[PDB]
Design a protein around this nucleic acid. Structure first.
Lengths: 140, 145, 53
RNA sequence: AGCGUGUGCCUACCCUACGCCGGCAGGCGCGGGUAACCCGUUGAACCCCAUUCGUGAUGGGGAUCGGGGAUUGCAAUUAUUCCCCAUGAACGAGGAAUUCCCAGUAAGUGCGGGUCAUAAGCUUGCGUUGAUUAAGUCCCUGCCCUUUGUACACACCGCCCG
RNA sequence: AGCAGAGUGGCGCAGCGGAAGCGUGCUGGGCCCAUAACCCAGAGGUCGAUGGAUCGAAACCAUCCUCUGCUACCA
């Protein structure tokens, strides 16, 4: 985090309230801020051993030197709502083999982890091949 | 009868007096036909005549009833935008401000650099759609020697 | 040993099984089937049906 | 209007009337149905009757795309599905070619079943509206029978010459 | 320098007073069990400059420049 004017100040407070209020809110007040799909995941779910992640983040954030980010906490979980408390941590997210590391911004809140790590090569081409049409055939 | 005036200019788009009132107004972006048949009735005027038959006094009221819809008791769900996101309110966006707002949300999703902004910048479909047989601009491919 | 061996199967194509051997792929439910379409044919003679049309 | 279908089944699940709340998706309270018994006297679409639009890429077309609301699930991101507002593209009757069809038939139009925790532009059946053209021929494509010719029998997609 | 041609819109040749003309090629489609032959479909765009008539100009007509073809000299 090194941004400005994306969740406080002139230009942008997160739906009319700063980050500072969010951290003191419970999930209950927080979810009522419009983002419909989020509200399912909280009201139904209520912690199905996401315990393992959220303690490591706070822990590592605490022990890390001031003006320096922690190491990483890794996940195979690509699903979990990005939240204000999570911000400032650094998380590696499993793809099919690779843990792509990302810094968490206060501007990413509401989204999932898995949107910030891709799981395919964008694509290049190409040079059409042989049978790539109604012409390829014959040899002997 | 009624030779008084025809084509005119209003905010950001030129609106003809040739067409009926509701349908004339739709040309302005952020206003569909569904949005206009409401706003005319809140203004309590005919929609059964042409747009060139409105007076200046009348059309002055139209834009006020349009741009403060909550204060003239058009419901929140009936707006374009409910809690924009990071602005904190219900809003109604019209022609040249719509584009400015739109370009921000594109920029935002490449700022965070989600899956969205990458698909935008690459010029590929955002939503769940196959691109294998969808598109073409391109198709000239050869392989012989 | 282990503390897991399973994960929720409660709906979908994996929580029902067809009676060949516990075969699948060949999604089947009809009128209380649970009976595989390949073998259904072999039980055209057997009772449940005789072909008439 | 018709063929059907429906919880008590697989392991956790059906079809819904009625009352109440919401613009809508939907929520909530009660009741029936093992079914010619309850949903359902299946109060469906095209069609029919009256307004509005006017030859204009138009209010035809609804692709693309932004924001928001619901439902299923252990989980919905590369948007499961559904709803609301906004955005408004190609396309103005289609080359060379080619498919299918003879009477409740073609075509138009809706519905049930199948897969199904959530979900048909598919497939399988069913009703509804309902023409034009033919009553023939071997021209093309192909098939049956006889006669004839053959260097073919891996059978003309054959064999074979410089 | 005398005469002639041209100054691409894929190629090569450059067709005429209506914005690619001809020939060819490449790429794709069609026909066929398949190939050849045969039949169709393409492609961002004052076509060196300065002007006039013109609805318009590689193309209707001029004034200039350059490159080449044939002829051929000033240097």
């Amino acid at each position: 985090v090194e941004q400005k004017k994306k969740r406080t100040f002139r230009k942008f407070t997160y739906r009319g309230v700063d980050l500072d209020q969010l951290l003191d809110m419970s999930y209950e007040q927080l979810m009522q801020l419009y983002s419909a799909r989020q509200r399912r995941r909280l009201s139904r779910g209520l912690r199905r051993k996401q315990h393992s992640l959220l303690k490591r983040l706070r822990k590592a954030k605490k022990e890390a030197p001031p003006m320096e980010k922690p190491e990483v906490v890794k996940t195979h979980l690509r699903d979990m709502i990005i939240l204000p408390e999570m911000v400032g941590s650094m998380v590696g997210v499993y793809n099919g083999k690779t843990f792509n590391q990302v810094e968490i911004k206060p501007e990413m809140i509401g989204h999932y982890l898995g949107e910030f790590s891709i799981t395919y090569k964008p694509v290049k081409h190409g040079r059409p091949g042989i049978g790539a049409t109604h012409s390829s055939r014959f040899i002997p | 009868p009624e030779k008084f005036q025809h084509i005119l200019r209003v905010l950001n788009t030129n609106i003809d007096g040739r067409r009926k009132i509701a349908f004339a107004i739709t040309a302005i972006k952020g206003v569909g036909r569904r949005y206009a048949h409401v706003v005319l009735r809140k203004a309590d005027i005919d929609l059964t005549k042409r747009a060139g038959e409105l007076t200046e006094d009348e059309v002055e009221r139209v834009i006020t009833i349009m741009q403060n819809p909550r204060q003239y008791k058009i419901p929140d769900w009936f707006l374009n935008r409910q809690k924009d996101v990071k602005d904190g309110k219900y809003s109604q966006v019209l022609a040249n401000g719509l584009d400015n707002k739109l370009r921000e949300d594109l920029e935002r999703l490449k700022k965070i650099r989600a899956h969205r902004g990458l698909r935008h910048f690459w010029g590929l479909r955002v939503r769940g759609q196959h691109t294998k047989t969808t598109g073409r601009r391109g198709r000239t491919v050869g392989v012989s020697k | 040993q282990q503390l897991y061996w399973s994960h929720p199967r409660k709906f979908g194509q994996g929580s029902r099984s067809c009676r060949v051997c516990s075969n699948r792929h060949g999604l089947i439910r009809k009128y209380g089937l649970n009976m595989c379409r390949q073998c259904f044919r072999q039980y055209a003679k057997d009772i449940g049906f005789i072909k008439l049309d």
